[PDB]
Structure formats: structure tokens, C-alpha cells
Amino acid sequence: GKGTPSLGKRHNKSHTLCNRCGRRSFHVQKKTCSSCGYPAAKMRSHNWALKAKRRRTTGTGRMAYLKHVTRRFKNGFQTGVAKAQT
Amino acid sequence: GRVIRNQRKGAGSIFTSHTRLRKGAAKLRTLDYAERHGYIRGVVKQIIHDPGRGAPLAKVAFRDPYKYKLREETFIANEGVYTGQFIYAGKKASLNVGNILPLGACPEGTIVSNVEEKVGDRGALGRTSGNYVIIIGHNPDENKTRVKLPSGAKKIISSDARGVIGVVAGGGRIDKPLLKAGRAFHKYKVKRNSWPKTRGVAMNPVDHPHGGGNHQHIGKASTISRGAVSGQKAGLIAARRTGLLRGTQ
Amino acid sequence: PSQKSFRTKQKLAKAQKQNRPLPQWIRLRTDNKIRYNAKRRHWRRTKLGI
Amino acid sequence: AQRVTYRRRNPYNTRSNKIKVVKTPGGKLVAQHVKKAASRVKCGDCGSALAGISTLRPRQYAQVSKTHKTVQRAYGGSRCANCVKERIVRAFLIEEQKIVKRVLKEQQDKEK
RNA sequence: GCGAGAGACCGAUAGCGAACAAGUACAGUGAUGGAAAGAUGAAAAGAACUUUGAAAAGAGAGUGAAAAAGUACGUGAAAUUG
RNA sequence: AAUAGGGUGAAGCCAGAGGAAACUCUGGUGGAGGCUCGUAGCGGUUCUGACGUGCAAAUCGAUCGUCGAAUUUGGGUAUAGG
RNA sequence: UGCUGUAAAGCUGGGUCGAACGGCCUCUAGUGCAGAUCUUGGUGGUAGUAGCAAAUAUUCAAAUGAGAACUUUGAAGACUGAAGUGGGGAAAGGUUCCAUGUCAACAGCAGUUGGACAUGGGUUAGUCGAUCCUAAGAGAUGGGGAAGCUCCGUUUCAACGUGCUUGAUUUUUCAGGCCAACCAUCGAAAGGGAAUCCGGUUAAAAUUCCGGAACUUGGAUAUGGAUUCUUCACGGCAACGUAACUGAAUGUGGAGACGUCGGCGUGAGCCCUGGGAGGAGUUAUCUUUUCUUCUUAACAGCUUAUCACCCUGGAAUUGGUUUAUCCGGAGAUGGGGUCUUAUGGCUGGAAGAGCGCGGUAAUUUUGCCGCGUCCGGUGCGCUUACGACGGUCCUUGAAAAUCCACAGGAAGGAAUAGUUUUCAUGCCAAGUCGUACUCAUAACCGCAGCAGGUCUCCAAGGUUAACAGCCUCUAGUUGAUAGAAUAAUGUAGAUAAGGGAAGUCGGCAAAAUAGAUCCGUAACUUCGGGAUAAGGAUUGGCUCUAAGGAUCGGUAACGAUCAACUUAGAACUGGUACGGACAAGGGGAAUCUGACUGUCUAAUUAAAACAUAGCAUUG
RNA sequence: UAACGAGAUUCCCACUGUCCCUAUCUACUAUCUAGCGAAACCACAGCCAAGGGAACGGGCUUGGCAGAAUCAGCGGGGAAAG
RNA sequence: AAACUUUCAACAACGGAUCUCUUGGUUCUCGCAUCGAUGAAGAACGCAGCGAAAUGCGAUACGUAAUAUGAAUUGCAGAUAUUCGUGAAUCAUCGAAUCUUUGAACGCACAUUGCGCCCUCUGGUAUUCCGGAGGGCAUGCCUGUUUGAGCGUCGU
Ligand SMILES: CN[C@@H]1[C@@H](O)[C@@H](O[C@@H]2[C@@H](O)[C@H](O[C@H]3O[C@H]([C@@H](C)O)[C@@H](O)[C@H](O)[C@H]3N)[C@@H](N)C[C@H]2N)OC[C@]1(C)O
Ligand SMILES: CN[C@@H]1[C@@H](O)[C@@H](O[C@@H]2[C@@H](O)[C@H](O[C@H]3O[C@H]([C@@H](C)O)[C@@H](O)[C@H](O)[C@H]3N)[C@@H](N)C[C@H]2N)OC[C@]1(C)O
Ligand SMILES: CN[C@@H]1[C@@H](O)[C@@H](O[C@@H]2[C@@H](O)[C@H](O[C@H]3O[C@H]([C@@H](C)O)[C@@H](O)[C@H](O)[C@H]3N)[C@@H](N)C[C@H]2N)OC[C@]1(C)O
Ligand SMILES: [Zn+2]
Numbered sequence A: 001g002k003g004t005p006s007l008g009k010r011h012n013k014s015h016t017l018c019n020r021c022g023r024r025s026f027h028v029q030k031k032t033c034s035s036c037g038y039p040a041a042k043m044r045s046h047n048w049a050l051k052a053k054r055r056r057t058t059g060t061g062r063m064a065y066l067k068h069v070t071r072r073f074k075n076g077f078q079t080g081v082a083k084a085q086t
Numbered sequence B: 001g002r003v004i005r006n007q008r009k010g011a012g013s014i015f016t017s018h019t020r021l022r023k024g025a026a027k028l029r030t031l032d033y034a035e036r037h038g039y040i041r042g043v044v045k046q047i048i049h050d051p052g053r054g055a056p057l058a059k060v061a062f063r064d065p066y067k068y069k070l071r072e073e074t075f076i077a078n079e080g081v082y083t084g085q086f087i088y089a090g091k092k093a094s095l096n097v098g099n100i101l102p103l104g105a106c107p108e109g110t111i112v113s114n115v116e117e118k119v120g121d122r123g124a125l126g127r128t129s130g131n132y133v134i135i136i137g138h139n140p141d142e143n144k145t146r147v148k149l150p151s152g153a154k155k156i157i158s159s160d161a162r163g164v165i166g167v168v169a170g171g172g173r174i175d176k177p178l179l180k181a182g183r184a185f186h187k188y189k190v191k192r193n194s195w196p197k198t199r200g201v202a203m204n205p206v207d208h209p210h211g212g213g214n215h216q217h218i219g220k221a222s223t224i225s226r227g228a229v230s231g232q233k234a235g236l237i238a239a240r241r242t243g244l245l246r247g248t249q
Numbered sequence C: 001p002s003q004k005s006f007r008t009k010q011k012l013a014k015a016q017k018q019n020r021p022l023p024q025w026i027r028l029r030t031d032n033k034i035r036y037n038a039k040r041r042h043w044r045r046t047k048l049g050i
Numbered sequence D: 001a002q003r004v005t006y007r008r009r010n011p012y013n014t015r016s017n018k019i020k021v022v023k024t025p026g027g028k029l030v031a032q033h034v035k036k037a038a039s040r041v042k043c044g045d046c047g048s049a050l051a052g053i054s055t056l057r058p059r060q061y062a063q064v065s066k067t068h069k070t071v072q073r074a075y076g077g078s079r080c081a082n083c084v085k086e087r088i089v090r091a092f093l094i095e096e097q098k099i100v101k102r103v104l105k106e107q108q109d110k111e112k
Numbered sequence E: 001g002c003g004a005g006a007g008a009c010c011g012a013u014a015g016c017g018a019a020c021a022a023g024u025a026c027a028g029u030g031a032u033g034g035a036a037a038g039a040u041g042a043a044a045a046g047a048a049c050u051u052u053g054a055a056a057a058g059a060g061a062g063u064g065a066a067a068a069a070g071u072a073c074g075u076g077a078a079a080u081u082g
Numbered sequence F: 001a002a003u004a005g006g007g008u009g010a011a012g013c014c015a016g017a018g019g020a021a022a023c024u025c026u027g028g029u030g031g032a033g034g035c036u037c038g039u040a041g042c043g044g045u046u047c048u049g050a051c052g053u054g055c056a057a058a059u060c061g062a063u064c065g066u067c068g069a070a071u072u073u074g075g076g077u078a079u080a081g082g
Numbered sequence G: 001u002g003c004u005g006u007a008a009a010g011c012u013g014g015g016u017c018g019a020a021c022g023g024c025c026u027c028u029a030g031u032g033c034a035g036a037u038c039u040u041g042g043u044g045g046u047a048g049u050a051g052c053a054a055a056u057a058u059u060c061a062a063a064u065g066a067g068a069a070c071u072u073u074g075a076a077g078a079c080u081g082a083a084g085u086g087g088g089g090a091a092a093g094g095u096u097c098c099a100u101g102u103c104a105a106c107a108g109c110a111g112u113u114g115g116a117c118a119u120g121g122g123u124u125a126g127u128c129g130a131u132c133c134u135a136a137g138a139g140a141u142g143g144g145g146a147a148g149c150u151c152c153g154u155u156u157c158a159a160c161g162u163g164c165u166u167g168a169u170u171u172u173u174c175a176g177g178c179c180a181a182c183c184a185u186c187g188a189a190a191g192g193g194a195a196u197c198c199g200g201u202u203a204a205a206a207u208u209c210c211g212g213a214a215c216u217u218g219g220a221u222a223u224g225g226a227u228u229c230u231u232c233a234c235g236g237c238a239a240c241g242u243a244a245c246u247g248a249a250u251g252u253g254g255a256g257a258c259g260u261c262g263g264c265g266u267g268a269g270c271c272c273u274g275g276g277a278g279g280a281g282u283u284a285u286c287u288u289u290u291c292u293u294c295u296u297a298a299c300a301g302c303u304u305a306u307c308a309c310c311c312u313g314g315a316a317u318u319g320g321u322u323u324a325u326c327c328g329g330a331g332a333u334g335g336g337g338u339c340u341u342a343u344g345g346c347u348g349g350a351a352g353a354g355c356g357c358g359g360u361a362a363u364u365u366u367g368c369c370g371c372g373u374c375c376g377g378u379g380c381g382c383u384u385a386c387g388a389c390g391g392u393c394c395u396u397g398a399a400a401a402u403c404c405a406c407a408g409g410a411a412g413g414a415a416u417a418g419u420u421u422u423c424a425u426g427c428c429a430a431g432u433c434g435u436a437c438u439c440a441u442a443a444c445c446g447c448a449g450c451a452g453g454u455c456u457c458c459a460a461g462g463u464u465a466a467c468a469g470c471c472u473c474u475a476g477u478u479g480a481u482a483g484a485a486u487a488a489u490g491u492a493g494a495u496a497a498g499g500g501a502a503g504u505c506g507g508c509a510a511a512a513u514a515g516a517u518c519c520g521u522a523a524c525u526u527c528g529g530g531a532u533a534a535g536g537a538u539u540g541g542c543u544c545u546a547a548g549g550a551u552c553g554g555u556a557a558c559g560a561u562c563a564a565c566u567u568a569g570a571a572c573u574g575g576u577a578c579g580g581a582c583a584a585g586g587g588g589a590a591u592c593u594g595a596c597u598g599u600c601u602a603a604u605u606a607a608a609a610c611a612u613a614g615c616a617u618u619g
Numbered sequence H: 001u002a003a004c005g006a007g008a009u010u011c012c013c014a015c016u017g018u019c020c021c022u023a024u025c026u027a028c029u030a031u032c033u034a035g036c037g038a039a040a041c042c043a044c045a046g047c048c049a050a051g052g053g054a055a056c057g058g059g060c061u062u063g064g065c066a067g068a069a070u071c072a073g074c075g076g077g078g079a080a081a082g
Numbered sequence I: 001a002a003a004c005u006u007u008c009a010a011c012a013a014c015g016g017a018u019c020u021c022u023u024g025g026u027u028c029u030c031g032c033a034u035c036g037a038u039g040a041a042g043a044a045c046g047c048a049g050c051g052a053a054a055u056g057c058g059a060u061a062c063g064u065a066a067u068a069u070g071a072a073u074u075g076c077a078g079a080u081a082u083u084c085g086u087g088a089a090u091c092a093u094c095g096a097a098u099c100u101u102u103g104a105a106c107g108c109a110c111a112u113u114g115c116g117c118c119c120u121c122u123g124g125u126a127u128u129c130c131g132g133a134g135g136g137c138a139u140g141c142c143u144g145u146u147u148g149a150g151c152g153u154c155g156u
């Protein structure tokens, strides 16, 4: 009865959604995400899993602020406004 | 091999004691001024069953010397103590059943229970049902009392250590056979997970030093040195002798 | 279940929204490649995993 | 015969999910959910139920007037009449005996 | 990481896993695992209209240099089949 | 949270009889037990039955064990790879 | 289509096709395939073959439609048979819900149908949950380890309140007085817990909407009542009663708050039943007849009780008393009272609602009117709640939030005057999230619409010990490719002359027994058992008879009225049948072995294995 | 060693298709049809006897022989498949 | 002899090889130094006249301002939108802003859209009770301020 009959008794979730990475890897009883290590301060990662670093790294999201650092650096980190040409 | 059951007990995971239904720790009052210099009077409110314990306990109420407040105490009830009885504790307490006295104030042959090993530790000796401590003699110059413990050992204790006059109630439990595996099941259901017990010779060699073989047998001496390490101490640890005891001791 | 949390119900609403066929006017645009929605989900075939 | 269903989401026969089968003016047989029974107020010395005290669920005692919660006597809603009587006699007899011990002891010291 | 220029390199089973809504679809409780899939035509001009059929479609017609290019679309081998 | 209907008939209690006495006997009452027959339940003996590219990566039929406790079971919780 | 070369190969004719490519001299390499149970993709024979056979079963007609074994309607025949194939939920899913349209793919035949496809619609709360509490447990913090990721500690070697109450002051300042044992926080949609019912309403929501009627908590505050010259009420011998009827710190008590079994009592719902008032059915004959309607919520008032308690009184000729033998000079029996309101009764809610008949307007939204909706009986019935008892354990069967009460006597209170919202009435407010649907032989998990798995509530008539089996009502289905035949061999199920284990490793399999009443019952035994030992007899139908009660009324040993099914006996009777289906032990004499009940190799071993009580040894 | 046992074993009574020795009956298959429609396996294939031969051949040598297309069954062989 | 089987050729299938390309990959070289409590990287959920994704963005949501530039956008629709012009389209440029719920993530808590406290304003006859708007309350450490503690200790 360890195969099909036992597989019918799966209705209690071990993991739920993680607030940090949103992945359904937050272990309910341990209160820890098996993916990002939440609620530890540092993000979970390992050098033996390079492909896991690809899935969630800088550039896989929006980069809503780093997107513009290179353009701001080019202009010398200007402060002020553009001056109309007369 | 594998970690044996002996070794697994110490991690305290499934082997912790079952304490939900217990009625509080059984202790004497803390040594305070009243018990050091005089006596204090309390009243027995209840005599109750403590699951996992063969001896009943007595809930005893005392006034607080220093503020307007009642104090409840959890004592081990001696046989003959009753609800509504006054209990006197201190250096000047009279020699009556249930009173708590220092051992120096009790003459030779006094029967006493829940006896302190060190002054003020609130009771260590003679605490189970039907057991007691006998006062053998006094050494007034050294302030030491010699007592006889339930096992037969003789011990010198400070004369300021306290004890409770009488015999712990509930004596005679072991005279009636259990008759059933189920009675043992109910017994340990409120103590800890130590029952049933599989025999080491019924296991495989991974499980236990006694396991394996084409017959069930130990194969080496079951008397194990005191200096053996964990995983080796199964059997009769540091036995001075073995076999049926004949004659006297 | 009927008894559900806000976070779960919020996830369910989004899944319903994305479970729609392609609007037809998309296929008429210049250099359009999409001919159907390749990310359809049916409740009994593939589960949401929430 | 008409059969009934629970009116709440709890499907189990727990201590707080008890029902009563009642017939409505619509002619229908419905289950109604029954609150847990109340216990008597009990004496603080002997543990017996106190007469004259309403039997209510403890949050409901804040809704009634004082007369349903007490008795016009010392220790009214706390101790029963027999333990109050026993407390009075004991107080009197012991305090009289303290004077007797006091006077007796001075006799012990005056003559010795 | 950011910005550039190159090659006796690979040429869609190759080259990064991914030339495409690719770390996507999908699987696993989870850590993780992880594809397939490029090309009508210069231009949709993507076949009006008639007719048979319930319809899908077919037959005429039409567009086009080509329909032996009809969105099952460049060429269109072999196994296998009429 | 759950567990038809029977059988047997432990202590305790009432009444009667016998006897010189010590004592003995009888009829009721009562309703004990990891007691018993037997449903639901839980289990899984045998046919070495069916099936054996299955309804099914362990199932189906009959026959069986047990069925008030060391009973059955939901949920919560703890123990983690020598 | 031919030509050249021994060959690897090279060239050429014809067809197809649409954008680049070749000879020669050299350079260079990811440079030549038949194999590697090679890799990826594609395709065959097998083969229109195996097969699409569990779960009793379908049929006629009409409608629709191009098309109907499979859709809809009508008419039948069936089944689940209340332990459901019925009505709901928890987990899980997530729109599958509903209406409209639609059939390419999917529903292993079909399809006009669908949990499919497309477009829209749909989930309404102070009272139901969550939210709060604590449980096993998890876990921050001064800290102590560890190179460190972090580990340990939570009754934590700590100067640990983002305190509380007043007399007021507004000066947004003060001033005092009480204390700080405990308490970061998380942990239950089944534990604990403030408060809602009925009727109606949608295509799809309802204890959430509409109509009506209530309740709880928090706050504000007016009026009346109550209280005060004896300042903080009276009455009762008492148990205690009431519309109210000051009470700080502090202390204490109660509720929350708890196992299990046994019989007994009461109530409710259901079941059964008489009369009457309607309606339906049957009618060759009959049935004062067969079926059906006659109902009453939360909440408010008065009242209502086992137990318990109080007053009186003073007991052996001991009495009272339970199905169960316990109680009485520590005060019984007797007499009289008090209290809890579980539960029932009457009234309000409330007949205005619902239900049953009858009529009428009308292509109608939605109806409108009339009448009735009444009075009883019964119980070892069934289920469920409660009560008073009794048994049981080397087992004695959560915690906290929260609410109340008491003790205490601080403070403040009178006279032409202070209270208190624990007396009545009046006013204001109650946030956030969930709420559709499935809950399974198709909405969950098993790759799937899989004969597996997956927690729980309600429960009608007959037969019966029975919630078993068998038949039926309400409700729900009629789903599982179909047609024609009926060889062999199968699978499932039957029967068989004479013999009766000769079969076979072995009685495997099957047969035989079986309910109930009466009779009868050995060895052995731990005296409890063995035991249903073994083994005999009986059993239907019909017509009778006897026994076993309740309430009234004064040798009442009686008369009257009423009532439940148990038991026993008799006559008559039949193709000798009769626990007539259903349901339901085969038994005996021994040996080996483990004492027993119990447990394990999920998916080849259930055992003599493990455990066990008992015994012994060791620290 | 009483009691208990889906434990192993012998005998006996009852019982019977286990057997002498088989027969007959029913439903569902198989069968034939409409629709639907897989897989295992496959060097090439497929009639025998002897010989020799990797010492037991479908093929080779020598003989016997040898006629399309096929259906239901079957378990000798394919030292059949897994 | 047919059917059937087998061989070849033609056409039609099945299937996606070959050939030809290529906004991709791969490798080498050259130049540059710029993430975050002033809240990053990442996550969730939303935002368009008609959008599921990808791309962009944040309730000012396929974007606002500014500077430049100079007539589009386009699949369809459409102006109270524009053309010798403060003017169509423009991540062209970019220095000003907006930036939901989160996240090192900071009042506490988090399987909850759960629970406080402080200040200002404001609604309900309100210092308390109920509602709304804006602004705040994490930890370790440093410098300084203020208020304190200890017979640790000086002096009066
Ligand atoms: C219509 N079906 C779609 C279609 O987009 C399909 O495209 C193929 C296309 O890739 C082929 O075209 C091909 O052309 C060459 C050559 C071998 O033909 C290939 O190497 C190349 O991969 C591919 N572009 C074209 N010949 C047929 C379409 N159905 O590819 C995906 C699909 C789902 O099957
Ligand atoms: C007696 N010597 C053994 C030695 O044999 C060895 O044991 C390995 C054990 O470590 C392996 O196990 C190892 O790998 C497995 C897995 C990933 O394969 C892990 O689950 C495991 O944590 C890891 N230790 C196990 N697979 C085989 C044993 N013989 O490891 C050392 C040892 C325990 O001392
Ligand atoms: C020599 N220095 C010692 C220093 O070691 C320490 O003593 C502790 C003492 O405080 C502890 O004791 C303390 O802590 C325990 C806690 C551990 O449970 C508490 O229960 C106890 O009440 C408390 N006194 C004691 N158990 C061990 C000593 N070494 O504090 C006292 C000291 C003198 O400074
Ligand atoms: Zn995470």
C-alpha cells in the first residue's frame, strides 16, 4: 500500500508562499524558505549550484535603480536642471 | 554499526518526561527567618494524586511573614496527614507526624522523610511511597547527624538540614502484581517512553552489541568495565559480582 | 476551500485574468508573430501550485 | 423524516458544536446550535453550590443586577451559610480562648 | 559590470540551455530539474464572385513572376504509403 | 472525534434453608472482564482464486483475524542521514 | 540520358528549383559511418489485431436538429433503500458555479449534450468564522560559546514600567500616592471564546439581501424611580427575598475547567395512533376506507425541579428507602418552607407568517379575495440532551485569555440636600479578511473523467435481537460503446445415480452445521473454566384460553375507566410443511510449540519470531 | 501445564464431483458486425530426415518433396519474450 | 488468368533531411570604475480606448516635468490634438519628480492585508469612546546634550 493507496493521503502542505521570493518554498513548521533562506538576513546561495544563481540574480528583475547609474555616471552625477538654449 | 537506544535517550527528543498532568514539584519551604529561629504554622488544604508518582502530595497554606499574602506549598504527604491538619515547620516545631524539623532536633531512631542533603535544598532523600530515613545518631560538636537511607546506606548530614516526621504515604504499591501489559502501558503513559523493552539479543549487530548470531546469545561477558565508552555499556555495568544472591549481605 | 486567505484569493484572481485567449486585433499588427496565447491553463490539467 | 445539517462550517461533533432539532413555523425541521451549559457557583470552603445565585456562563454575570449574584449576608456570593456560621463561631471561641491563655499565663509567672 | 572593435570560430540535432512571449512551458513537498520551437511573397495582392454541401471543405473563378509559394506556407531527401 | 445487537454473569446487596456448634447450602439482585458470538471499524489467513502489456507500479472476489481496549482515527507538534 | 576511372569518385542529358557557386596551385581542420542494448527526430510490420465484458436494465412516443441507442419532455420498467447512488461540511482544488452561444480538439462508440470551447454574470455579516487566548512546542532580548555561517539560554548571574490612580490645572505644565512576583512574540477555521431568529427573495448569494422581531459590546447622557434628618434600603426565626439600595489600595474565592463505563429518570425530535375539517385515490365487490394538510423561531414576562439547604420535632417493636443498600442523636421518619431554571406550561413574538382548499381579473409585470388551519391517546420504541446515582485505575483523566463575587474599610458623602448608568426608559456606533461551487465510481491525490486512497454531521415504514440481510416512502440516479448469435477453451455460479478421500505433498476447494425454546453434556482444570463440549427434541397457519398492570372511588380481598406486548397452554388444520427467502458454529481423540490479549517484514514469510505480566542480576 | 492459537502434525465421525468418470445448465467473454484502436517483439526469415559442423540447423550437403488467398483454435518448435 | 505478393518508373503522400541565409552564439583584443538605510538587488500585485504574454511603468502607473528636435502614430478607432509652431511623435536626451505591497527592511506581528503608542489637523453634543488626513516610534556603535546612580570618592 505504499504506492497508489498511500499517494491518496497528500492534502497537508509542507511549504507555502515565501514573502521574500514568492516561490512556495517557505517551510511551514520551520518558518524558513528552502530557496532564499528567509528570514535570514542574507540570501541563500551556493557555489555548487551556479544554475540556481542564474535563476535569481541581478538583472533577472527590473533593476529599477541600477538601470540608470551608468547614465548618471556618464554625466558626472549632475545636480541642477537643463538650461534652455537661447 | 548504529547509535544504540541507550545513546538515543540522552538527546531527549521522545524520551523527555510526560509532565502535562503533574501537580507541581514537591519541595519544602525555603529556609527563612521563621524556620531558622522559631516555627511557622500552615494548614493542609488538599491531599492529591500526582500522576507518575506513587506517593500523594499535600497542598499546604502558609502566611507570608513580610507582606499580606498567602503562600501555597507542595509537600510529599506522610501517612496519617489529613486535610485540615496544622503543620508546624521550624526549629521549635514539635515532634509530630507531618511537622518539618531540623535533624538535630530529632532524637535517635526518629523516622523522617523528604530529607535535605544540604541545608536549604528543600528535600532530596526518602521521597517515594512507603520509604523513610532513620536517624542513627548525633555528633553535636561537629553539628552533624548520621542517618540510614532507604537503600541501606549510612550518611552524615548537617544537623541544620530539615526533614519531615513520618513515613511517605502510599506504601505497598509493589506488593500487588501488575498482571498485564496494559497496566504497565498505563503506568508509563504518564512517566516517560521507556516501555516496552526490546532485548538486545533479539536485534541485529548494527542495533546493539548483543545482536546477531545464528542463535540468540550474548557471546562475550555481559559485565562491562566502568571505563567503557558510550555504545559499549550494555549489560551489567561495573558489576562487582553476578548471579543469584544467597545468604546475607 | 471556501475559507481562504486574502493572499491566496489575490493569487487566484490574477490566474483567472491570465487565462484568456488572444485578442484578435493583435494578429493584425505590423510584423506580429503571436497567433495564440501559449500560456493557457485549465483547472483540471495543470495545477497552480499555490 | 426530515434530516438536518449544521448551520456553521464546523462539521465535527465537538463540545461547542452541539445542535438541537426544532420545528419552525414554516413547518421545517432545522438544527439550532446550543450553547454550553453553565455551572453552579460553588462555596469557597466546602465546594458546594450556593443557593440564590444564578447559574450563568461567566461572561453573562456582567449583564445581570447584583441581587442575582449575591446573598444578603456576610460572604454572600462567596461562602455558603453553614461555612459562614462555622467561621463566626470559630472566630469567637478562639479569641475568647486567647484571653484565657493570656490570663492563665500571667498566673504562671506571678506565683513563680 | 559598463562601453567598443574584431576572428582561417558555429551556422538552427551546430553555436550559450535559450537566434523565437527561455531560465519560458512543464515536473518535484523541497533543494532543484528544465525542453521543443528560425525562412509565404517584392508587396497580403491572405483568394472578390458563382456553384455543390449541414458544415469542414470541393469545383469554377481570381491575385501573383511562381499557388510545382494558400499563413498544414522557401527548397522539400530517405524510411514508409496510395 | 468514533465504536449495532447478543452471550456469560465477578465483587457488593436482599431473602430463605440446614446444623449442637464450627459452619454449610439455596433463590434472587447486581453488572465486572486487555471475557465471548457478531456488525461498522481496524487488519490481512487461504484459495498459492481473478488480474498479471491490470481498473490498479499491490487492485478485485470469496474465505478469514479482531471488534471496549497495549482500540481506531483527523489536525497540531517534536525527532534528519553513520 | 549517357561517358570516364581497377576503385574511392568525377563529368554529362531530362525534370524540379530560386541565389549563389566552382576548376587549378597551396594552407588549415570540429574532414568521410552500418553497427557502439550509440544520440535526437521520424516511420513500419505486428494490425484494423489484442481489445473497448466489475458496480441488476432498459423501452415507446413526441420535440429539436442536416444528422438522435446516447440531448430535452412525456409515459413506463428499475435501482440506491436513511450505515443512501439522499442533504451538508473540514482538508485539497480554484470559477469547475449560472445564463447564453457553440462542437475543431477532449468526453478510448457517438454527440444536437458536457466539469469541453466562447462571451458575460455571480460570492453583501456588529451577531457565522478568522482575528484574540493559551497547548505540546517555536522563538527575540543584557548575555555565554563559536574562525564564522551561527549555537546555547526564555523560572534565562540584567539598573529591563514606551506603569496605574488621583485633586485638578490647562499654564498642554503639575503635584502627590500606589505598586512592578508574572507577562517580547508566535502556536488551534475540531480546544477556550460577547451577541440573531423566523418568513420571503435569485439564473446563480444568503443565520450576510428584503420584511418583521431581538440581542451583545463600547460610549454618551437625559428623564423617572430608588437612596439620605437613624446619612450609604428594607423584609424573613432561618434557608433567603427584592427594581434599585457608596465602597480605593490590597487579598481571596468562583466560573472558564474537563476521563471512562453501567443501568435508572425526565425532556425534545422522530415513529405509532383516535375524532373532526379539507383534498387526492380505488371502486365488478368491499374497505365509518388507501394516501395526504392541520405548523409555530430567536427573544420578553409569569410560572415550573431532581439534588441541596432551612425551621420544627426527638427516634428499638429500629425506621425511611433505590432496578442497583445506603441513610439517621454529627438529628431519621413525620409536618412546613428556601434555592438552582436544566426542562416543560401559559401569554407576548403570532397569524399579519407558513400550509391546505375554493374563486376571480388577465396574451399581463406581480396578483387579489373567501374559508379553515381544531381536540386527544400511547411506549423496556429510535436518536439525542440533561439529571440523580453506581463502578473503575501502581491510569485519577489541559492551559490561558476573560467575567463575576467576596474580605477590607481609603475616600467621599445629609436636610430644604450628595448619589448611581449593577432599577426602567431614552441616544450613538460596531472596522478588516473569508463567504460562488465540488467534497468525489468525473471538480482532491494517484501522469487520466483510474473498480485505489481521503476526516466528519443528519437518518422513515415492514421483518428482526439488530443501525445485519431482504422489500418499500421522501430524495437521487437510470451513468458504465452498441447490435447479432450462443462453437471450443476460459471467468463467475449451479446440480448430479452408486461409492465416500480410493484423489492429492496435504480434504486444497467444496459440502455438511447454523436462529430460538426445552433436554442433556466427558476427560482435564490454575476451580475461574473446558461448554454452544458431545448429542437429542421442538418450531407454520388459524380459532381460543390463562398469567403478568396504571388511575380513580370508604374483609377496597371490591367496582369503574384506561392501557404495552411478553410468556404459557389448548383445539382445529395441511402433499410431515413450518429459523420455509434472508440470516446463520461442523464436531471429537491426541502430539509439537508459544502461557494468555497484543505486535512486525506497506509490495512474496503473521510464525514457534517480537512484546508481555512474573522472575533474577547490575549501577 | 488448564485456557488460548487464520501456528506444525496424526487419527476418527459427519460431509461431500477431490476421485472412480464424467455429464448437463446459467451469465459474461471468446465469436461475427458498426465505431474506436494500442503493445511486446522484429539480422534476414520461416516444411521435414540424415550428415558434417562451435560436438541438438530455417539457411550449408544429400535426400523426401513442393500450388494462390485464408478463418477459428492450439501450445511441439522458433535452444520464443521479459 | 485474377486477387495477393515482389521489383522498377511516374505522379500524389508521409516526414523534415539537403541547400542557401542569420538583429543569435562563441572566442580574442581595446577602453572605463559607477549598487545599497538618500532604502539596493530580488519578490508580489496592479497600470493602456480596445492586451493574454514580452517590453515599460507605479494610483502622477505602456508614464509626469525638463532639454533637444521638428510632423507624425498606425491593427482599428479618436480629440474639446497638432503644422511658417511654445509644436505631432520620440526610454532622442535626461539634471526635476512620482515611485503601490514588500524586501538588508526598521513600532510589534505576518500561513493574518492582525495589533498598538505618540504629535498636528478634522467629523460625530468629546482629555477618555468611534471615524478620517498628514507626520512619527528598529537594532549595534561613535561624538555631543540633558536627566541621573553608586559610603567608588574629594572638599565644604
Ligand atoms: C505551423 N506550425 C508551426 C510553424 O511555425 C512551424 O514552422 C515550420 C517552419 O519552421 C519550417 O521552416 C523551416 O525551414 C528550415 C527548413 C528545414 O525547412 C528549417 O531548418 C527551419 O528550422 C524552419 N524555419 C517550414 N518549412 C514549415 C513550418 N510548418 O514551426 C512551429 C509550428 C508550431 O509547427
Ligand atoms: C563504515 N564506513 C562508512 C563509509 O562506507 C561511508 O558510508 C557511505 C555513506 O556515507 C554514503 O552516504 C553519503 O551519500 C548519501 C547519498 C547522497 O548517496 C547521503 O545521503 C549521505 O548523507 C552521505 N554520507 C552512502 N550512500 C554509502 C555508505 N557506504 O561513509 C563513512 C562511513 C559511515 O564510516
Ligand atoms: C566567581 N564569580 C561568581 C560568578 O561565577 C557567578 O556565580 C554563578 C551564580 O551566579 C549562579 O547562580 C545564579 O544563576 C542561576 C542560574 C544558572 O540558574 C540561578 O538559578 C541562581 O539563582 C543565580 N544565583 C551559579 N549557578 C553558578 C555560579 N558560577 O556570580 C557570582 C560570582 C561570585 O561573581
Ligand atoms: Zn523565499
Ligand SMILES: [Zn+2]
Pocket: D043, D044, D045, D046, D047, D048, D079, D080, D081, D082, D083
Ligand atoms: Zn461551604
